[PDB]
Amino acid sequence: IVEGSDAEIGMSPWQVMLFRKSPQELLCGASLISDRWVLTAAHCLLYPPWDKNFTENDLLVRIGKHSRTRYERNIEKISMLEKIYIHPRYNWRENLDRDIALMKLKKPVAFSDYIHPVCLPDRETAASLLQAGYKGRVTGWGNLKETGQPSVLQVVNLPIVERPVCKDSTRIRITDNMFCAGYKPDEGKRGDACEGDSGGPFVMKSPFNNRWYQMGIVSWGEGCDRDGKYGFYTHVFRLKKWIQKVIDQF
């Protein structure tokens, strides 16, 4: 996260760290959506241009974390993966369309002050809140600048951007399964996701029921925190029928 701040304790209790078993290293962010299900970006698990194709036994998830590198004894919980599910129309060839994946845990994680699931949006919460200028919150342990790494989880609040501005900022083909967020050069304020924040959540606090909803997944950007560029996020509601199909079937 570029130009963010240290998270408060328990501020993002749905935060999940995707962790490589060997060598031991952070791979991505992710989010807890129930006691058995974790949501992430498909490119965190499958990206052939970078020779990335993880299997379940390659990975762990670490839940309840604050420190990036410490083993947070008596606080964090470490879970093995039962199964990975990648969206069947995830487009790793062109533009990361439908950049979404689910991971089922081998055993349910116990909720605590530090571990708690985020809500997924319904159609109405998505329609109300996914509007240009409305701000969401992005969290992660990724790089602090494009060209370095944080001690603890970082947080930044960013406004959703008008779709024509998102489209006009890039040569990548944008789809309805994406939205973009970040400040404009004239707005003064800054902030972005960066490498290592992939797969983490873009959340909004509904003013109707005071619950946090995950509206996006950290997906892609060209650089980090560049003027005139924006971060792009998987549109969770647009892909929720697939999420529900997977969870209902498995």
């Binding site: 708690h116 919150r137 947080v155 606090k205 005071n210 619950r211 946090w212």
Partner: peptide, 28 residues
């Protein structure tokens, strides 16, 4: 879950975090 999105150390205690008001103020 029926309890989703309500943080134990914040919403469940009626405590606000330091920047959530920035989000609320943008929902115009």
């Amino acid at each position: 879950e029926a309890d989703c999105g309500l943080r134990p150390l914040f919403e469940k205690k009626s405590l606000e975090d330091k920047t959530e008001r920035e989000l609320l103020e943008s929902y115009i």
